[PDB]
Amino acid sequence: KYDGSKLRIGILHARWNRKIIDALVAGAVKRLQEFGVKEENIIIETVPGSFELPYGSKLFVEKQKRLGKPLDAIIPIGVLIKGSTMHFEYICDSTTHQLMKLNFELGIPVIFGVLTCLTDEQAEARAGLIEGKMHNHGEDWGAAAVEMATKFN
Amino acid sequence: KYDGSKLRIGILHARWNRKIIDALVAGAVKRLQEFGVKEENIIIETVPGSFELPYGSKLFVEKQKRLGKPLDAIIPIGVLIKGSTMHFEYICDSTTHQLMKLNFELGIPVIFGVLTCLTDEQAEARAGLIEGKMHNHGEDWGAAAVEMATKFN
Amino acid sequence: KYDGSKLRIGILHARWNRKIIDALVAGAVKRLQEFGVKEENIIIETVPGSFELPYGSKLFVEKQKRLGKPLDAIIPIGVLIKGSTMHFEYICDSTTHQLMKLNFELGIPVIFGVLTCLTDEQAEARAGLIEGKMHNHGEDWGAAAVEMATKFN
Amino acid sequence: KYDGSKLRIGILHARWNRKIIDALVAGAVKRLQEFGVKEENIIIETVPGSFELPYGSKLFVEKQKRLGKPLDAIIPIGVLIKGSTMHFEYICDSTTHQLMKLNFELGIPVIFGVLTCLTDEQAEARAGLIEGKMHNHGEDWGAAAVEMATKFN
Amino acid sequence: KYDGSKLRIGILHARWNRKIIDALVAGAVKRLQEFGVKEENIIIETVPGSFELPYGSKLFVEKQKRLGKPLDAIIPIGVLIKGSTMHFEYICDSTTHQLMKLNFELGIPVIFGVLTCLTDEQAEARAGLIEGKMHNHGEDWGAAAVEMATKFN
Numbered sequence: 001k002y003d004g005s006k007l008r009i010g011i012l013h014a015r016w017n018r019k020i021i022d023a024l025v026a027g028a029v030k031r032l033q034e035f036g037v038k039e040e041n042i043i044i045e046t047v048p049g050s051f052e053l054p055y056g057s058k059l060f061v062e063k064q065k066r067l068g069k070p071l072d073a074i075i076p077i078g079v080l081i082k083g084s085t086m087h088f089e090y091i092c093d094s095t096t097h098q099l100m101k102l103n104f105e106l107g108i109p110v111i112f113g114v115l116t117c118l119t120d121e122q123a124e125a126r127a128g129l130i131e132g133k134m135h136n137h138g139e140d141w142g143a144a145a146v147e148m149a150t151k152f153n
Numbered sequence: 154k155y156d157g158s159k160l161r162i163g164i165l166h167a168r169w170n171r172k173i174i175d176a177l178v179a180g181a182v183k184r185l186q187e188f189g190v191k192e193e194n195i196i197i198e199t200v201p202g203s204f205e206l207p208y209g210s211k212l213f214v215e216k217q218k219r220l221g222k223p224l225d226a227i228i229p230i231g232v233l234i235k236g237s238t239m240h241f242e243y244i245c246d247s248t249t250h251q252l253m254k255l256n257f258e259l260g261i262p263v264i265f266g267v268l269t270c271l272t273d274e275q276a277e278a279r280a281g282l283i284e285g286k287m288h289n290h291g292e293d294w295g296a297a298a299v300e301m302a303t304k305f306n
Numbered sequence: 307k308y309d310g311s312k313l314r315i316g317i318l319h320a321r322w323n324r325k326i327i328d329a330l331v332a333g334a335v336k337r338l339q340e341f342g343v344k345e346e347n348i349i350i351e352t353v354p355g356s357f358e359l360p361y362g363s364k365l366f367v368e369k370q371k372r373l374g375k376p377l378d379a380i381i382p383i384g385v386l387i388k389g390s391t392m393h394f395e396y397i398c399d400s401t402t403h404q405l406m407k408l409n410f411e412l413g414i415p416v417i418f419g420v421l422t423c424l425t426d427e428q429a430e431a432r433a434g435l436i437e438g439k440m441h442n443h444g445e446d447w448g449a450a451a452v453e454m455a456t457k458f459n
Numbered sequence: 460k461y462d463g464s465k466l467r468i469g470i471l472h473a474r475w476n477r478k479i480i481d482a483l484v485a486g487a488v489k490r491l492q493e494f495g496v497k498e499e500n501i502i503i504e505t506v507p508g509s510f511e512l513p514y515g516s517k518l519f520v521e522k523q524k525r526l527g528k529p530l531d532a533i534i535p536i537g538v539l540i541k542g543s544t545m546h547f548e549y550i551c552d553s554t555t556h557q558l559m560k561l562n563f564e565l566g567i568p569v570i571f572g573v574l575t576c577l578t579d580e581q582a583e584a585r586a587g588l589i590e591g592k593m594h595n596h597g598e599d600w601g602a603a604a605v606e607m608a609t610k611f612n
Numbered sequence: 613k614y615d616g617s618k619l620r621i622g623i624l625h626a627r628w629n630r631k632i633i634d635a636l637v638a639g640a641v642k643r644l645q646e647f648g649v650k651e652e653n654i655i656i657e658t659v660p661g662s663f664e665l666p667y668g669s670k671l672f673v674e675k676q677k678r679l680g681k682p683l684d685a686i687i688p689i690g691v692l693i694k695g696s697t698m699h700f701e702y703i704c705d706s707t708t709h710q711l712m713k714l715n716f717e718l719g720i721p722v723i724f725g726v727l728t729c730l731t732d733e734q735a736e737a738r739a740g741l742i743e744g745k746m747h748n749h750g751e752d753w754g755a756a757a758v759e760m761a762t763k764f765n
Contacts, residue, residue, distance in 0.1 A: 085734050089728075090728050091724075103211075109205075109208060118237075148205060297354045301361070403553050406554070421544070457504075552705070555703075559706040571703075576698070599661075603664060607671070
């Protein structure tokens with residue numbers, strides 16, 4: 001239904017919880033390929049943590065413009081696990097809100113690719129790392145990116 | 154009291170929990186028509202999830218303008234059921250704030266059509282899918298859209 | 307202490323929990339008139355629910371400007387009672403925040419007239435409907451509107 | 460440590476929980492004077508409740524500009540105690556966020572002088588009203604106002 | 613790897629919980645110099661509390677611009693420990709959201725250096741003050757500042 005061959009898609013991912021992140025990125029990449037998005041047009045860049053996702057996304061989008069290779073959509077990818085402090089709550093809160101607002105500031109679809117889990121098992125399951133359980137959410141984010149960049153043209 | 158015969162209403166809905174979504178959409182359509190809105194002027198469009206509703210609404214509104222068929226009001230519809238992670242809470246929080254803010258950005262009424270439930274039964278009951286329980290919240294939203302787009306002319 | 311004779315005050319109220327709504331409006335109307343605000347200068351208008359209060363207020367204010375009868379302040383009145391789902395939480399949160407911001411966007415005092423209760427009794431008690439318990443919060447909202455429109459002239 | 464002899468500081472306080480409010484203001488006033496701020500350059504003004512603090516601060520700042528006596532900093536003082544309903548949570552939430560945002564919109568330091576307590580005992584202790592317990596937070600607010608107005612000139 | 617030799621990084625830290633604050637700053641300063649940032653190009657400045665961090669950061673950024681020694685990135689540092697009242701919740705929430713927004717308002721990376729802990733031991737552990745327990749989170753913030761200011765040209 002959706003054609004991604006003409007699109008350039010950016011994936012910006014954190015490096016905290018790298019094992020789970022890698023699996024999510026791979027899924028997003030996989031689904032992008034299935035929609036016809038060219039390999040040269042899947043751009044992957046990293047940031048340290050999820051807090052750096054929103055501003056990192058802006059800087060990433062702006063750099064791509066300056067390069068003459070603008071992005072049609074972006075998938076910020078982060079994994080946050082509930083720890084002992086309230087750090088989890090406040091990172092999740094601020095990140096989710098800014099990424100949402102970033103749809104309008106940037107003028108391109110920003111797909112919420114942040115997992116917000118209470119356990120490591122929960123994040124692993126939603127990254128496809130536990131076999132026979134659930135699915136890789138990265139794949140959904142890939143499909144969402146193509147559609148949102150296409151549907152309303 | 155309120156006549157919608159000269160109005161063009163947009164409905165944008167998520168695709169997760171499709172059975173409950175379809176019931177709410179139909180309830181909004183049914184009520185829209187009771188206020189006099191013509192079938193040709195009820196425009197239905199989809200996005201994958203509730204996070205995509207706010208920016209999807211923006212792209213939908215701007216598309217209809219470019220087509221020369223501008224929307225007088227929009228009803229973003231989504232269904233969110235509490236899962237095992239905090240994903241429910243941050244999607245609800247961010248989506249709600251942006252849909253609220255979107256009234257002012259888009260310059261047209263944006264009717265909050267997002268169910269934020271704890272059980273599947275609760276969402277079914279609020280879509281009128283339980284024979285004796287409550288009512289279809291979709292109908293209330295249709296009536297809201299007509300009133301909000303007309304009352305202050 | 308505050309002369310309200312030269313003021314025009316708008317009251318925008320929701321229609322859900324109407325019995326409690328009516329009493330809060332009645333209290334606001336009473337105290338408004340006690341500070342000298344004339345009946346012809348108290349404009350009452352309605353919206354379906356509390357979510358429509360923020361944008362309804364803007365549309366109400368804009369309409370009153372086009373009529374050549376500008377409002378000096380506005381009191382959005384809503385009654386929200388905790389249900390079974392999270393609907394209460396997300397309506398309250400985004401409604402409160404927008405009404406707060408509306409002070410600066412509209413350039414007139416917006417008095418927070420939204421009850422956020424857990425039981426019907428709590429709302430009734432804070433609306434002056436329980437015989438010997440507490441008072442009608444509506445009156446306080448009336449007093450506030452007059453003061454905020456006058457004190458800093 | 461900082462010189463406040465050339466500063467004009469405004470104090471805007473709510474009128475609920477007055478006993479505690481008066482103690483908080485008296486602390487702020489006392490500490491202001493210790494930094495060199497003159498009695499004539501400490502302007503006290505009131506609003507009804509904490510919700511009125513944000514916009515009341517704007518109106519207060521603007522009036523002082525029209526009087527030719529601008530403020531170099533403002534200390535919005537409120538006392539909020541948790542009751543039976545959710546009123547506490549939502550007033551605290553939107554007031555704190557708006558007072559924070561007010562720093563950037565007014566262009567002067569806005570010092571958070573709102574106590575957000577669960578009990579009356581807690582507000583009294585944080586106002587210096589309990590003999591062998593803690594200190595008056597109002598003093599800290601007076602120190603903060605002076606510093607934030609001078610340190611970065 | 614990132615070259616911080618040409619960078620100027622600012623550190624703005626609160627003063628409450630000084631013992632923990634100092635460890636975080638020392639950790640950030642240390643990592644900065646490992647990435648090649650000169651000691652004349654690491655500017656430390658202070659504010660009273662965490663609530664002053666966002667507006668202090670702007671005042672600090674603007675001051676450095678006026679001096680001809682602009683900042684390429686800023687690390688606002690603060691320590692918040694849960695107390696008896698709801699003070700903790702509302703300072704974390706508004707500070708976190710504003711520091712996040714500040715990335716876009718200032719046009720430089722704003723590294724989130726605020727600990728949001730339930731106990732003192734939790735903050736000590738995340739500052740590297742407990743041997744064999746976790747690490748100094750300050751060190752990450754140093755690295756983040758250098759990466760975010762360089763990676764995207």
